[PDB]
């Protein structure tokens, strides 16, 4: 756990199965010169390349079933490595191609593509909550763009009021006109 508004912060996540409780420690005091600034060396500051050490070996299939049914296991999340930059780029470019085919004349296109890109880069397969924390900004921008597009398609406007007596703070100040 990461947040300061959690009581078990900097404590290992608890699972139904027995798991080593020694946590991955991100690089909090990195050296000044980090000669390799590629994704390969940057990802090691926040995730382990080989994945986490919290994976199960189930003695039975029904334990697996029950964990999945209750929301405590996905192999996507628990039996997996980090994704390489090439893999991330391939996924992002495929998603962008599919979205462009879905609709070229859409303004939220690149915003959707950007949230996809950020999820992939943040390794949402293994840290979905951590990645959503990074990507909800682009989801919000897409949410805004959706309405901004709808109001342009369906002509929606409002009666603006007359100009205020003190719209300008100073008479000698310029009133830059805004649409």
């Amino acid at each position: 756990n990461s947040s300061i508004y959690d009581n078990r912060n900097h404590e290992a996540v608890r699972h139904p199965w027995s798991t080593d409780a020694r946590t991955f420690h991100p690089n909090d005091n990195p050296e000044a010169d980090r000669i390799n600034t590629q994704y390969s060396n940057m990802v090691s500051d926040s995730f382990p390349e080989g994945g986490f050490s919290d994976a199960p070996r189930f003695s039975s299939n029904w334990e697996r079933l029950l964990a999945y049914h209750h929301g405590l296991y996905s192999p996507e999340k628990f039996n997996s490595t980090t994704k390489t930059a090439d893999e991330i780029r391939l996924a992002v470019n495929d998603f962008a191609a599919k979205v462009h085919a879905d609709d070229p004349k859409n303004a939220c296109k690149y915003l959707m593509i950007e949230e996809f890109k950020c999820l992939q880069s943040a390794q949402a397969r293994i840290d979905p909550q951590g990645a959503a924390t990074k990507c909800v900004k682009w989801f919000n921008e897409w949410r805004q763009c959706a309405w901004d597009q709808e109001k342009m398609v369906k002509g929606y406007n409002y009666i603006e009021d007359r100009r205020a007596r003190k719209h300008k703070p100073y008479i000698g100040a310029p009133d830059l006109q805004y649409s």
Partner: protein
């Protein structure tokens, strides 16, 4: 002031949304728990109700967490 008088359809950014929800939570806690104070909500007042025989003990030591080496 931003929506109805300046013309912004999206007045609140993510920060302002978080602040709004934080304040909603603080309101909820203040109405749920009577006399709640600083460490859980930003609020301080002096005239508090105490049991009458107030025991004072030391906090426990921070939990030894496992670590490599």
């Amino acid at each position: 002031a931003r929506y109805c008088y300046r013309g912004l359809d999206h007045p609140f950014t993510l920060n302002e949304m978080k602040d709004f929800l934080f304040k909603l939570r603080e309101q909820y806690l203040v109405n749920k728990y009577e006399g709640i104070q600083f460490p859980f909500v930003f609020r301080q007042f002096n005239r508090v109700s105490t049991p009458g025989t107030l025991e004072v003990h030391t906090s426990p030591a921070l939990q030894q967490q496992p670590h490599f080496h």
